[PDB]
Each structure stands twice: as structure tokens, then as C-alpha cells.
Design an enzyme around this catalytic site. Structure first.
Site, mmCIF file in Angstrom:
data_model
loop_
_atom_site.group_PDB
_atom_site.id
_atom_site.type_symbol
_atom_site.label_atom_id
_atom_site.label_comp_id
_atom_site.label_asym_id
_atom_site.label_seq_id
_atom_site.Cartn_x
_atom_site.Cartn_y
_atom_site.Cartn_z
ATOM 1 N N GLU A 10 -3.287 6.119 3.220
ATOM 2 C CA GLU A 10 -3.870 5.825 4.522
ATOM 3 C C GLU A 10 -4.453 4.426 4.646
ATOM 4 O O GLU A 10 -4.435 3.865 5.743
ATOM 5 C CB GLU A 10 -4.908 6.891 4.880
ATOM 6 N N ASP A 19 -7.913 2.565 16.482
ATOM 7 C CA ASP A 19 -6.643 3.251 16.228
ATOM 8 C C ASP A 19 -5.785 3.305 17.509
ATOM 9 O O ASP A 19 -4.953 2.417 17.704
ATOM 10 C CB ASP A 19 -6.839 4.635 15.555
ATOM 11 N N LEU A 29 -13.499 8.626 11.757
ATOM 12 C CA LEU A 29 -13.751 8.508 13.195
ATOM 13 C C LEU A 29 -15.264 8.468 13.422
ATOM 14 O O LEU A 29 -15.983 9.374 12.987
ATOM 15 C CB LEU A 29 -13.108 9.689 13.948
ATOM 16 N N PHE A 99 -5.090 15.327 6.681
ATOM 17 C CA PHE A 99 -5.641 14.011 7.005
ATOM 18 C C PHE A 99 -4.654 13.187 7.844
ATOM 19 O O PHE A 99 -5.071 12.427 8.719
ATOM 20 C CB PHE A 99 -5.973 13.259 5.707
ATOM 21 N N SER A 112 8.324 25.611 4.246
ATOM 22 C CA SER A 112 7.890 24.824 3.094
ATOM 23 C C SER A 112 6.585 25.342 2.486
ATOM 24 O O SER A 112 6.495 25.435 1.260
ATOM 25 C CB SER A 112 7.781 23.347 3.457
ATOM 26 N N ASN A 127 13.020 20.931 0.549
ATOM 27 C CA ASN A 127 12.885 21.301 1.960
ATOM 28 C C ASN A 127 11.929 20.396 2.743
ATOM 29 O O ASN A 127 12.150 20.167 3.932
ATOM 30 C CB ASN A 127 12.485 22.773 2.096
#
Ligand code: H9M
Length: 349
Positions: A10, A19, A29, A99, A112, A127
Site C-alpha cells: 500500500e 485519495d 483515513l 485493507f 477462493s 483460482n
């Protein structure tokens, strides 16, 4: 462990940024008003921050976000059975997904998650790579998939090692935290480019480098991971995409404005005339018809420094100004230096 994983995927930002909301550190945030964000951060840290934090202060906010993510996952019907069944390393990979796209986004990988809950690691890893998540962030997704496939930090370890081994090739013998003049030289040599060329300045823009003739461990590590590069050959293949971005006026303005902050001496608010001209001949090349006449005008009638506002507005000037300078309003908010230039240039045509 988890902090370094999401620092790699990130990214970490010590200053307040936007953002699409006011954000800091690893996607923390703050609010939804810059003064409200500065006040919220001030209360969260317990000091007058002014929108600038440290790595430790960023980790404190991240640990709060981890607890918030774990609380969230457990309250979700589709994610709670899977989280409980997973081990510490794979739980971190599941948190990484939350996240990135939130609970509802992770819940979309029903087939999955089912395989992960049933501990079919190789079947889940295959997958998970089929989805658009793999096309979107190929570097990030591959790292998270490998974590789910093995239950080890190998994907993040290998990348850190591949980068840190490459860093040793450019670090200063007298200073560990930085890359010296000789190291910057080696970096540009390995990339087959002149350190004073436009391509290197484009690289500095994507790397968000602070000052010329200076390259820090942080700037190298952060820049290389963000662009998805573990080798010099990988960064060389990235340069044409970086170049093509500048054909869009919005990206060129960001790049042009960045050049001033990169070129200026640390401690100076303005930029030296000789340095400003040298960068103007580099960034405004084939964009400003009056570029040479402007440099000539400055060297003869303005021996002083170049302010940020005058630098930024010269781009707006170059774009607008007609070849005969007829559309220029001698009393239309332009800086005095530009007023003086049009008055100087017009009799010469
Ligand atoms: C840096 C400066 C010292 C100023 N002192 C007050 C004397 C200097 O000597 N500048 C001369 C030259 N600048 C360059 O060649 C720089 C060198 C680089 N610095 C970095 C920092 C980080 C990176 C990473 C992103 C990989 C790369 C580089 S190269 N190069 C640039 O600024 C790119 C154009 C200037 C070059 C323009 C003409 C005037 C002299």
C-alpha cells in the site's frame, strides 16, 4: 511483519495527502477540511503535527487499523469462518485483502475463500490469479497469493532482499542511509542515461525524490516497490510509460511543478537563476517558443532568484501566449517579471 507487508503493498506517506479524503501513513483515513484532518491527527498522536508524522507514529495508527480490520472481518458472516481457520501468516494476507478492497470486495471471492477454509493452498492460489485483482495490481496480488500458497513471508522477504542487495551497489561508504554522488552516477550509468537528462528527471518525479544530487534509502526502497521494480532492467522498461504520461497536460503540470522543488537548494524558498534556466531548457524544450528569448531576458534584466509562483505561471504563460504576443493583457494578474518580458520582447517581435 504485517506493518512491513502493507508498507510494501500500500505504501507509507509521512505527510497528509488526498485519495479520491484526508489520508496519512498506510492508508489511515483521518476525516471528510484540512484543519479537521490536522486536528483529528493531533488528537490521535497527542502533539501539534501540522500534518507531518514519523514511521513510529504511522505504525501506531496502522496497529489501530489492524484491530479495526480484525473486528470487521469477525462481524462478517462470509469472512469470519475463513479467518478463524487460517494461521497467523495467512490471516495477515486476508487482512491485506480487506485493507485493499473492504469486506464486501473480499466476500466476492467465494470459491477462493472456500478453498482457503478447506486448506487447499495450491488450488486457491491458482483460482485467485484468474480474477481481475491479478490484472489490476500484478505485483501486490502475486505477493498476497504466494503468502496464501505457502504460509510464509518469502514473497516479501525475497523482494526486500532483492532490493537491499541492489541498494548496497549505490550506497555511500561514509553514509548508510543515503546514495552518494558516485552512487547516483552508477544508478544512471546502469540505466544507460546521462544524470543531467530529462529521463532521469522523469524518474525523480515518479520516485518523489526531494533534492537533486541526493538519493535516500527510503526514496530508493519506496520508489522501486511502488513502480513494481526489483531490478534495473524492470525500471528501464517502465521509462516509456512514464514518458507517455507527460503528453497529458495534468501529469505534465505535476511534473513541471515538482521540478522546481527538486531543483532548488534545501533552505531556499526560491531557485537560482542559472539553475532555473538549465531546468527550463530541459522541461520547457519544444513547449515554449520564447524560451531562449526568456533566458536571455533574465540573464540581462533579472540577476535575482526565481519564486515558486513565477515558475508555475510561466507554464500557463507558454500555453496561452500567441507568437506575436497580441493576446497578452499587460494588466491581467501575470507576475511583473512576465509583464517586463512581454514589454521587452514585443518591439523585437
Ligand atoms: C545537485 C547539484 C548540487 C548543487 N550544489 C549547490 C552545487 C548539481 O551539481 N547539479 C548539477 C546538475 N544536476 C544533476 O545532474 C542531477 C543529479 C541527480 N540527482 C538525482 C537524485 C535522485 C535520483 C533518483 C531519482 C534516481 C537521480 C538523480 S540524478 N540530475 C537532475 O537533476 C536530472 C535532470 C544540473 C542538471 C540540469 C542542468 C543544470 C545542472
Amino acid at each position: 511483519n504485517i506493518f512491513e507487508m502493507l508498507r510494501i503493498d500500500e505504501g507509507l506517506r509521512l505527510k497528509i495527502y488526498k485519495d479520491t479524503y484526508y489520508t496519512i501513513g498506510i492508508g489511515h483515513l483521518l476525516t471528510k477540511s484540512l484543519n479537521a484532518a490536522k486536528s483529528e491527527l493531533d488528537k490521535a498522536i497527542g502533539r501539534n503535527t501540522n500534518g507531518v508524522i514519523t514511521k513510529d507514529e504511522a505504525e501506531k495508527l496502522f496497529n489501530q487499523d489492524v484491530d479495526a480490520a480484525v473486528r470487521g472481518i469477525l462481524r462478517n458472516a462470509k469472512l469470519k469462518p475463513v479467518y478463524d481457520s487460517l494461521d497467523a501468516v495467512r490471516r495477515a494476507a486476508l487482512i491485506n485483502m480487506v485493507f485493499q478492497m473492504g469486506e464486501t470486495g473480499v466476500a466476492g471471492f467465494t470459491n477462493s475463500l472456500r478453498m482457503l477454509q478447506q486448506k487447499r493452498w495450491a488450488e486457491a492460489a491458482v483460482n485467485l490469479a484468474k480474477s481481475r485483482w491479478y490484472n489490476q495490481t500484478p505485483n501486490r496480488t502475486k505477493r498476497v497469493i504466494t503468502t496464501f500458497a505457502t504460509g510464509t513471508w518469502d514473497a516479501y522477504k525475497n523482494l526486500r532482499k532483492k532490493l537491499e542487495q541492489l541498494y548496497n551497489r549505490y550506497k555511500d561508504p561514509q553514509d548508510e542511509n543515503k546514495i552518494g554522488i558516485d552512487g547516483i552516477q552508477q544508478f544512471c550509468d546502469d540505466l544507460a542515461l546521462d544524470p543531467a537528462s530529462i529521463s532521469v528527471l522523469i524518474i525523480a518525479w515518479k520516485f518523489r525524490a526531494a533534492t537533486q544530487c541526493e538519493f535516500s534509502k527510503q526514496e530508493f526502497m519506496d520508489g522501486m516497490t511502488e513502480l513494481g521494480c526489483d531490478s534495473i532492467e524492470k525500471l528501464k522498461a517502465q521509462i516509456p510509460k512514464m514518458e507517455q504520461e507527460l503528453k497529458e497536460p495534468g501529469r505534465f503540470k505535476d511534473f513541471y511543478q515538482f521540478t522546481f522543488n527538486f531543483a532548488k537548494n534545501p533552505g531556499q524558498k526560491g531557485l537560482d537563476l542559472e539553475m532555473a534556466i538549465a531546468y527550463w531548457n530541459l522541461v520547457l524544450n519544444g513547449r515554449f517558443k520564447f524560451l531562449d528569448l526568456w533566458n536571455k531576458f533574465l540573464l540581462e534584466h533579472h540577476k535575482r532568484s526565481i519564486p515558486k509562483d513565477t515558475w508555475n505561471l510561466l507554464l500557463d504563460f507558454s500555453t496561452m501566449i500567441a507568437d506575436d504576443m497580441s493576446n497578452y493583457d499587460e494588466e491581467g494578474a501575470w507576475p511583473v517579471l512576465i509583464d517586463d518580458f512581454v514589454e521587452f520582447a514585443r518591439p523585437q517581435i
